[PDB]
Amino acid sequence: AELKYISGFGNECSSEDPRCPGSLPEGQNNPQVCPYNLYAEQLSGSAFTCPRSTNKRSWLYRILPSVSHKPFESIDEGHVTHNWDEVDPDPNQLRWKPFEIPKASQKKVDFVSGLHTLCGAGDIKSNNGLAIHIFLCNTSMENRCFYNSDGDFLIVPQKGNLLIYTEFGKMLVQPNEICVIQRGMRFSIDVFEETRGYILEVYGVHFELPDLGPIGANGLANPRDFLIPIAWYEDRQVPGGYTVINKYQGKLFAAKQDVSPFNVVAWHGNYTPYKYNLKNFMVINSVAFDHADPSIFTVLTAKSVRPGVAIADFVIFPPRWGVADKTFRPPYYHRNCMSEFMGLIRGFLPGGGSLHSTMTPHGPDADCFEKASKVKLAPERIADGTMAFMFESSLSLAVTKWGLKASRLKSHFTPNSRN
Amino acid sequence: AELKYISGFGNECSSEDPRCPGSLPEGQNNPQVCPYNLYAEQLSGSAFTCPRSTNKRSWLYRILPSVSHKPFESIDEGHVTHNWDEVDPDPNQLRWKPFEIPKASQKKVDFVSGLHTLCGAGDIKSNNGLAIHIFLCNTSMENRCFYNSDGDFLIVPQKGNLLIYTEFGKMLVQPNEICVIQRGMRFSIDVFEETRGYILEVYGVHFELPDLGPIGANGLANPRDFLIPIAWYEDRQVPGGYTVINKYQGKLFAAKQDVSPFNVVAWHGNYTPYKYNLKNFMVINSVAFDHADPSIFTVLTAKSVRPGVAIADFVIFPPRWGVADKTFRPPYYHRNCMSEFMGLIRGFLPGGGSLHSTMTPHGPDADCFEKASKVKLAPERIADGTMAFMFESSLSLAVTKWGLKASRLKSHFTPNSRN
Amino acid sequence: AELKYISGFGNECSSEDPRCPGSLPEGQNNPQVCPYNLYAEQLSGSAFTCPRSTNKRSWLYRILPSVSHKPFESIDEGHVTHNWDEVDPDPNQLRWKPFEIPKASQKKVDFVSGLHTLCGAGDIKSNNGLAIHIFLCNTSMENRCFYNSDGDFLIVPQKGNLLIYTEFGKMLVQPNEICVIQRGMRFSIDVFEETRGYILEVYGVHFELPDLGPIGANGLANPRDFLIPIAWYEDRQVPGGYTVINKYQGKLFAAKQDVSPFNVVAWHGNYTPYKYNLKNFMVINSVAFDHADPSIFTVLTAKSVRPGVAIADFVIFPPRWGVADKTFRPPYYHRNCMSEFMGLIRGFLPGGGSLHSTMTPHGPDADCFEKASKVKLAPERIADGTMAFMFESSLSLAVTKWGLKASRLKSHFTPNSRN
Amino acid sequence: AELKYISGFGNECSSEDPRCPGSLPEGQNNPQVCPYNLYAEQLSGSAFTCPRSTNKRSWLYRILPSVSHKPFESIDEGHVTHNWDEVDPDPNQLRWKPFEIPKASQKKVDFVSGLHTLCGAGDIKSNNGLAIHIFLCNTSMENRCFYNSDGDFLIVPQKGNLLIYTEFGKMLVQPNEICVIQRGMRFSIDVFEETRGYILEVYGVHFELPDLGPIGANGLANPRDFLIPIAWYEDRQVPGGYTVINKYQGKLFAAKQDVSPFNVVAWHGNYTPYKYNLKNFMVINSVAFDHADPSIFTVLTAKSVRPGVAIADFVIFPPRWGVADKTFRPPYYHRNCMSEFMGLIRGFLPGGGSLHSTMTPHGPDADCFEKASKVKLAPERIADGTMAFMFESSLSLAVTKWGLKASRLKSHFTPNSRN
Numbered sequence A, B, C, D: 001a002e003l004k005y006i007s008g009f010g011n012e013c014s015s016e017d018p019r020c021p022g023s024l025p026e027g028q029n030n031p032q033v034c035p036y037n038l039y040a041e042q043l044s045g046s047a048f049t050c051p052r053s054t055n056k057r058s059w060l061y062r063i064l065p066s067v068s069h070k071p072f073e074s075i076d077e078g079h080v081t082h083n084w085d086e087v088d089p090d091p092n093q094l095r096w097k098p099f100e101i102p103k104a105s106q107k108k109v110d111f112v113s114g115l116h117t118l119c120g121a122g123d124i125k126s127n128n129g130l131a132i133h134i135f136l137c138n139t140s141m142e143n144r145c146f147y148n149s150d151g152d153f154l155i156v157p158q159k160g161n162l163l164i165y166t167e168f169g170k171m172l173v174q175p176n177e178i179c180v181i182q183r184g185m186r187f188s189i190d191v192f193e194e195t196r197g198y199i200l201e202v203y204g205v206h207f208e209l210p211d212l213g214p215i216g217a218n219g220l221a222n223p224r225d226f227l228i229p230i231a232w233y234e235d236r237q238v239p240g241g242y243t244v245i246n247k248y249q250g251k252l253f254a255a256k257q258d259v260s261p262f263n264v265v266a267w268h269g270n271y272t273p274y275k276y277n278l279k280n281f282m283v284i285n286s287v288a289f290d291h292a293d294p295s296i297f298t299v300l301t302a303k304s305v306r307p308g309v310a311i312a313d314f315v316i317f318p319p320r321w322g323v324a325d326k327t328f329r330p331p332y333y334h335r336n337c338m339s340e341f342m343g344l345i346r347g348f349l350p351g352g353g354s355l356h357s358t359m360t361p362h363g364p365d366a367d368c369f370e371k372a373s374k375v376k377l378a379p380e381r382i383a384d385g386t387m388a389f390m391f392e393s394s395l396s397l398a399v400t401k402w403g404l405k406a407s408r409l410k411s412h413f414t415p416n417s418r419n
Ligand SMILES: [Fe+2]
Pocket: A334, A336, A340, A362
């Protein structure tokens, strides 16, 4: 059966499992005894003193508070790392073939076990950084959940659907859709095949919709298309213990508890997981001449404190009309102060990627330059049946050891002839 | 039958009349042909270029666009005025007995006809001002709606319930509740008895929830308690014409149309009417010593461009515990840079009011000073069964002609004895 | 012969008349004796204490300082007015046929004499307002210049070229181009036929290029396309006196002087007149679905202190591709918090206009709705050979007396059928 | 005899030792020869270009300038450290029994020698971090002073009074009082018994009073209750050299000089040490229903550049009335984006503490939940005779090696019964 959702990016939402009407306290957050005898638990996504525009928190009315668990124990990190200095810097463009997914025949690997950090920058405990990870897995998480104490996750499936269980409800996230799981939120993922995808992790900050500037009040990723799960719970005891995996200061820890963490009967707040279908992106671009800068395709942004400068932006290159006359339509040659990671949902193949590091020259190849400089221009369809994206950062990304192991024009100048 | 509502102050909402599921365009705002063959209409509450935090607009999917109406014609203003200079200034405190409601036996008077401006300040076309009005009526509006082209209305019923029809749906607003009808929104009101109330009108700005400062993430007027109407429409032809009343640049105009304006089948956006029950106010105050400044009871604020300075604030004095030890519990003597209008929902009686003008001294009377200076202090209940409020402004309010026609301690110093 | 220009919106420029090389003081602004024995004069466009981003001033090295003139004398205002209250408010849309230009045979009328205020709002001495004027003239200004002590002028010729003399040099401004003459700048205009155009005047503020938001670093009105005049002077004595016309606090004054005011041999600064050709506008719009808000066509903006809210914006509707699929391409039905004045450079004819006042409903007519709801959609050319524009303001414009003397859909709802 | 003080948080103060009236230069800061032949020395607490609201500096008129000292020499760091990575991360809550104070019989230990860093985060040279230290000592500092080149110290005595000598005068700081010694200020401390306390150190930033938001103009820590020392000097030569200890980039250095550094005869400025008595805190909380977020008890805040986000906040839980009806009065269950260090001035005992790391669940225990869910609610006294506090940070604190060596609920859900 298919899941229902609440819509509205950043909304102050209220949701009760349909089986327990009125589980949300009426007119208050902390009754002496909560309806149905539940426990009230607050998840604070921002400092308490943040202004209305940035204050984030959710109240969870659950069967047992999250404190009921045994002590965390250190587990092996696998390929999740934040040591940006084990590998010497390298300005050259890097390219990756679609990352290899392990076969279930060979090794049963769930989403957490198949998490591999590709590159990143910044300090984790300081709320200034990011990391890009690739998930390669083939089995559903069983009696195991995961939460990130360090920051937020923008998850981008490429091959394989994700059925995601969160304390706020469930989300089905398919390729060409994305979802965000914010700091502290426990989640579990069921897969249905050899699965591969990308994850943009930002330290201590949250994603927002970009101010539209001249675009105005509508356009790009409309708020209404962001979908939030409806409350759903399970009161399930787990023989042998349910395991909660914790990414804390970049290391992984495991804590056993008696029941599943998804026992939230009702919740309200503006700090929740969410998903978005990329096909709903209202594409804005040039309709007369010239080529628009790629920031015009920004979906979500994790703002730095410097005005207009992002820690990390999520940008997409969707199906659209190309109509610019007397214009070089392909991407212009470019040297940029930002790092540019590029992925492909559906030259690399879907599931691979490239990294253009800061100020390293890039641009179209000889064949693309030649073809675009000669074609009679007319309205054409671009990117149909494809979906490329970019994670761009203001920091200088550094590839990890694993990231490295996994990796791979003529002059026409007529001095005397202007026209 | 009782009305259902959507909750969440400032939320980006979606609502479809239950009779027409899927009337909202899927994944876009402007289909060539809207579901059910409706018209798409945008109501912009803010300039298009406002940042995400202040950009307000709603999309209405309706039977006929609002353009289908005959030309506006000037009608008599009655007691609605914005001429702040017909009456000479007067710094003295003014007091009003409960305003007289006209008897239906004598004159049938609807909400618009019984609108009387009490005081105000500022320029209307410039988006810098406010006006306080009193409504005195006894009959429902019949085939007549009202909209304010100049600003927003914070409506506070005192005697008599208000059944309010808006393009976004219906709201029942009873004494001890308030509702806001924002600029441009057409509305109609049914009454059920001789009716009286107060209206705070702010020019060209909108009300927001105050930043909580140290109070944090919860408290005062929680976002969840703000209620927005669910979509409701009527496809009703009106023999003789439905009349739309327009307050434009302070004057009143009337335009006839063939159908009722409440033909909005579905709508989405973050610019909507709303209501709030004052009893849900999570009261914050002093719990050790001293007397807290009244701004601690702020419900809604219409911010000026100067940080922390409001054009107009709505403040309430609700039922609460008074526990301050070694403290003068009543209001302190005060001279203030702001004008203070005071009303009473349930010395004046419910439905009357007072105006303390800028820097004019005010404070408790002799009997109140004497009683509070002597009582053995202990935890006590304050304001139970009562609800006083204040409209305070940074401008200097001036009473109107009508406002004027309607209107009405010992030294104990022991120089040589400290303790 | 055709004029040369310096390019770069807001640049800190330096210009010397070619006949007097080195007329600009080297390495300083105030030598004891300026090169060529000129006088140094500073024109301050902003308070001295404005930050770098808003500090505007120019140094003029001239033959005689502007102080050498006789006392100003009041002259007749003509049709230039700022009394927004002589005419009762009216919310109805107003429309104007192309304004009538006086024939030279009948009355010789220069640019200043043919200045007629159409509408406006705000207070003049307070730096918060605007006025829209129409110029109807047929003769060049002879030994007569004009300067505005109250604010800036965005001039939009419609019929007839303008040859404009300013202290900073000359500009030829033709229909489909615009120019800005900032506060305090003296100017004179030669015409070549019966001339008509529009003027957007903003009180005490200056126009800026809009922040591009997601559009990025390039697009809309590129800085390079803004053209500034190169220094040019004339040392010309005027028998009988040269007349300087002054718009001061909305009234007109005349002061005689011995020489032409355009005796500036060299100048440097970032406060200058400028022009822009509308054809260079890099048009941004929707390239997949839906209809973009008109703010996406903003050329120049006179910002208010409220973030994202403009006092007045200049918006154009240029030649472009229309490619939105499954979309109602024409303007959506709309009710707006801003006033909208519309003009046409090349339903009204070029040189006329319309005024949609605040919150008054507007949108496409029946025939336009019907045609656009039925056409098979495909890439098409829009606005070719035409140029419509809008002066939109956050204030509520009021038409003047002269402005007034000069002035002039079915339900398809299928309740039971969604798709 | 008891010390006198000047009052007023952040005031621009002037103070002269009573023995030398007129030691402050009249009408200037840098006379050629200062009164009494003193030297003028400026201590800059902020960059010179900071706006009025953040510009901090003090002028010291002293017997000898601070330059007269021999070269600094590295001394052993002891237990003062800033290496956050010698110890592997651990998300589990940590708890500390009251830290052991060394007996004078065993080892004479002064305040500097008994300084032990518990936990911290951030980079020292970059002005983005904090450290929490515990001082365990038993002897007064003799001919030895200390200054912090890296940041500010908020000192919280727990056991034992502190008599503190600073260049600005002396302060007596007792348990239940706190004092702040800002960056660069030299100080010495006399103790009177086995002494223990806590120190919150913030890198490159200063503490401010929190904006009150709705609380208004008075409340919490009133400015008047902050006490600053009055000028006091000693002209004392020290045989063998007076030793100045310097915390520079986290390491300790020692420089000998001929005289005591407390030879400041007069001083003026707004950058001074200060103290505050916690009993004067005007406690604000809920007086109707629900439980207020702990930020409502903020005393001082070291702001980050992100609005509303602090580097570190100092929060207290003082004696107050608890009156919330139909409310769970104890702390709610919580998962927070901030680290929370908790101490107790007068489950742990006074002088111990706990660390709830980022997003690790916490909340009341079973016995506290049970008791609070059942009690008939009525006005009660809370925290009388106790004083707990919290150092909360936006960074993720990491415990040091020493910090580690020193360290140590049922479901009631009735699915079918709401009410
Ligand atoms: Fe690039």
